[PDB]
């Protein structure tokens, strides 16, 4: 109503397009560089109808909208933080324990250790890895012996799990193992989803029967042949897929032999692993979300140094994101300061490099700042400007080093900079081209080709070819006295003789003489 009626009735047509009028008669936060173009566009060009397109289209900022979602405080106390960190450690532990349940994780680590020894105390490595290998070989024998029907035998298995939990593995190792287990489970559900896709859809076996039947062994053909011998309408179609299901079962049995585990529980342990992953990941996400304030508050001090506010706080977020990863609640030191250092390091190690167009190493950045911080005193503790010789004298570096250092400073300047302020000047418009050659120069070069091509005409074959082949012209690759002397029987001195005689011939013609200059 207000905006539409005022705009239309007033603009009829405001004669000289009185822009400075209605922009004051508009609500919301003013002095913007966004709402501007939406008014200069409508008024003219497509008049009349455009003024009817404007209302129907009317019927903002990164940082300000960033603070909006961050506005969701959800701050924590010492109790809160410890609680979250406790859930983190809880999730992580359940994951590692789930890794311990996996016997192929132990035997692989064993195999890789033998690799390590086949080429941090070396004896301490031999010590613990032996302890693991010992508990493994004793636990392994109590499997097929079946003594203590997986009751006390299970005790040795879980004790072996504890022994494995003693090892402090490297981030790349744990990720490789867990990834390998999920890839293993991928192949598992690959076979299960294959058997299901083949029997349920292609053979018209209802999902009810498939879940009632397959869920049993999932490996032996006892369920499959019982499904075929069930004499149902969907059992006759199974004959057309017998080889496929057989192949899937044989491959799944193969996996049983690879893991050495009951197929009816691999899902369970892998499940609990996924459970722990979600828990630990979740808690860590809440952590970084909660201490989000700290990022901006400290990043504010590093602002304006070749990188904008958003980029800084983003590097501070990943700095906080790394901090949360390396921290435990069982630690007297609080998170408020520990995270702060990681954030400072995160953004400062970003402003160092990804700031100026040209590359630069960290030591360069530090030396440069040190030079400035020292220079600001020399002119204030004396009275005159800081001479480069004396300024260098106050430093470990000689002087020429500092001179080259100042040749790396600044972005530097951009081409689009106005200079003479003509109509309109630009620095990059004065920049000449030197890689190109003068049309005169190109013309002379062609005339030079013609000159030489015509000069070697007034020579003999066993002399034209000699001069041509030696100085390598009109044949790309140039040859030497030997490679030419071999192709002309007589070697070295004889060919150099002719080579010098050709030069003797060119002591009268004026063509190449003037071409010289």
């Amino acid at each position: 109503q207000s905006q539409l009626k005022l705009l239309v009735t007033r603009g009829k047509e405001q004669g000289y397009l009185t822009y400075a009028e209605v922009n004051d008669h508009l609500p919301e936060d003013i002095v913007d560089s966004d709402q501007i173009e939406d008014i200069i566009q409508m008024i003219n060009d497509m008049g009349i109808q455009v003024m009817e397109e404007a209302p129907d289209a009317d019927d903002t900022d990164p940082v300000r909208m960033y603070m909006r979602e961050m506005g969701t405080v959800e701050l924590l106390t010492r109790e809160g933080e410890i609680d979250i960190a406790k859930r983190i450690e809880d999730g992580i532990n359940q994951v590692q324990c789930s890794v311990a349940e996996y016997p192929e994780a132990i035997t692989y680590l064993l195999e890789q250790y033998d690799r390590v020894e086949a080429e941090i105390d070396p004896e301490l490595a031999r010590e613990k890895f032996a302890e693991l290998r010992a508990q493994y070989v004793v636990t392994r024998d109590t499997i097929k012996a079946k003594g203590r029907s997986h009751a006390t035998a299970q005790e040795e298995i879980l004790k072996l799990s504890e022994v494995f939990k003693q090892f402090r593995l490297v981030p790349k190792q744990f990720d490789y193992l867990v990834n390998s287990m999920r890839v293993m489970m991928d192949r598992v559900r690959t076979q299960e989803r294959l058997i299901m896709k083949l029997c349920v859809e292609q053979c018209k076996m209802p999902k009810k029967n498939f879940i009632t039947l397959f869920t049993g062994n999932e490996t032996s053909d006892t369920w499959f042949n019982a499904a075929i011998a069930m004499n149902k309408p969907w059992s006759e179609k199974l004959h057309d897929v017998s080889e496929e299901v057989h192949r899937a079962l044989q491959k799944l049995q193969q996996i049983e032999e690879e893991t050495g585990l009951t197929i009816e529980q691999v899902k369970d342990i892998n499940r609990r692993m996924s459970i722990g992953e979600a828990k630990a990941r979740r808690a860590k996400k809440e952590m970084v979300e909660a201490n989000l304030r700290l990022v901006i508050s400290i990043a504010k001090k590093y602002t304006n140094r070749g990188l904008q506010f958003l980029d800084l706080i983003q590097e501070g977020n990943i700095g906080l994101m790394k901090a949360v990863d390396k921290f435990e609640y069982r630690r007297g030191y609080k998170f408020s300061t520990y995270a702060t250092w990681w954030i400072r390091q995160a953004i400062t190690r970003s402003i160092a490099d990804q700031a100026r167009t040209i590359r630069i190493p960290v030591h360069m950045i530090e030396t440069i700042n040190k030079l400035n911080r020292i220079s600001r005193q020399m002119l204030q503790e004396m009275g005159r400007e800081p001479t480069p010789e004396e300024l260098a004298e106050r430093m470990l570096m000689p002087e020429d080093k500092i001179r080259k250092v100042l040749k790396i400073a600044k972005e530097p300047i951009s081409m689009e900079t106005p200079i003479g302020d003509d109509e309109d000047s630009h620095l990059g418009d004065f920049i000449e081209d030197t890689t190109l050659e003068l049309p005169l120069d190109s013309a002379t070069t062609e005339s030079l080709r013609a000159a030489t091509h015509d000069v070697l005409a007034g020579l003999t074959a066993r002399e034209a070819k000699v001069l041509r082949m030696r100085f390598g012209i009109d044949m790309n690759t140039d040859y030497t006295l030997e490679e030419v002397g071999k192709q002309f029987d007589v070697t070295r001195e004889r060919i150099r003789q002719i080579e010098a005689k050709a030069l003797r011939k060119l002591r009268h013609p004026s063509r190449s003489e003037v071409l010289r200059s």
Binding site: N23, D24, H25, L26, I30, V31
Partner: protein
């Protein structure tokens, strides 16, 4: 040189109530209600062009 605002907003910003604002630009006119009727403080000069 920004968007327009009623020039009385700055007055309120100077801690001026609405009543004080009115008593800084205009001349008041008092009416009395006595003997069940309405009287008025008449000023002859003010009745110019009415």
């Amino acid at each position: 040189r920004r968007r327009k605002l009623p020039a009385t907003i700055i007055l309120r910003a100077l801690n001026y109530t609405t009543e004080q604002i009115l008593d800084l630009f205009f001349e008041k006119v008092i009416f009395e209600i006595r003997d069940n009727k309405l009287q008025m403080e008449l000023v002859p000069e003010r009745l110019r062009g009415e």
